Amino acid sequence: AKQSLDVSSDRRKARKAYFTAPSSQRRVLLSAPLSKELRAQYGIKALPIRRDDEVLVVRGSKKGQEGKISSVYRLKFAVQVDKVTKEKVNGASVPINLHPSKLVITKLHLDKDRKALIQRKGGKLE
């Protein structure tokens, strides 16, 4: 239950705040949990998702597939992961949009800001 008179339980307001979120807010909204191995290694549970992250799909119809995130398509709230495609009938190959909450990060793209982000969230960085 809500205890503060600053946040809203209004469903209409929550949906406007989701669907009209700018990209810097959608980055936090498009978070993805880590794997068992990375959660043991880094001490933290979920991070905002990145391009060069390696992921495993754990839901839907492409579950159990691997790849690198080809694109974080924040305008569609989606991630496009290579090796996860739809073969069209003309021979074209279109990327299937995935949600990061149905993904599991199995290898992070680490740089200085990601390391500081892990340490900020309390992570082991090991």
Partner RNA sequence: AAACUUUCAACAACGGAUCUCUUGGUUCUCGCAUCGAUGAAGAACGCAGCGAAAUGCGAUACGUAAUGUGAAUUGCAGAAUUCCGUGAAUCAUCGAAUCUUUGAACGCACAUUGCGCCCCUUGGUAUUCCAGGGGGCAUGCCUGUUUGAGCGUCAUUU
Residue from 1, 9, 19, 122 that binds RNA (CB under 7 A)? 19
Closest distance to Mg ion from the beta carbon of 117 (Å): 4
Residue 20 sits in the site that holds RNA (CB under 7 A)? yes
Residue 88 sits in the site that holds RNA (CB under 7 A)? no
Give the residue with the Cβ less far from Mg ion, 39 or 114: 114
Give the residue with the Cβ less far from RNA, 58 or 117: 117
Instruction: Compose the 49-68 pattern: x for residues touching RNA by CB under 7 A, - for all others.
Output: -xx-----------------
Cα–Cα distance measured from residue 40 to residue 37, given in angstroms and rounded to the nearest whole number: 5
Using CB under 7 A as the binding criterion, the count of chain residues that bind RNA stands at 29
Residue from 29, 66, 68, 73 that binds RNA (CB under 7 A)? 73
The candidate with the shortest Cα–Cα distance to 110, out of 99, 102, 118, is 118
- Answer yes or no: are the C-beta atoms of 66 and 56 closer than 8 Å: yes
Helix (H, G, I), strand (E, B) or coil at 17: helix
- Answer yes or no: are the C-beta atoms of 100 and 50 closer than 8 Å: no
Under DSSP, the state recorded for 100 is G
Cα–Cα distance measured from residue 126 to residue 117, given in angstroms and rounded to the nearest whole number: 14
Which residues, 86 to 125, sit near Mg ion by CB under 5 A? 113-114, 117
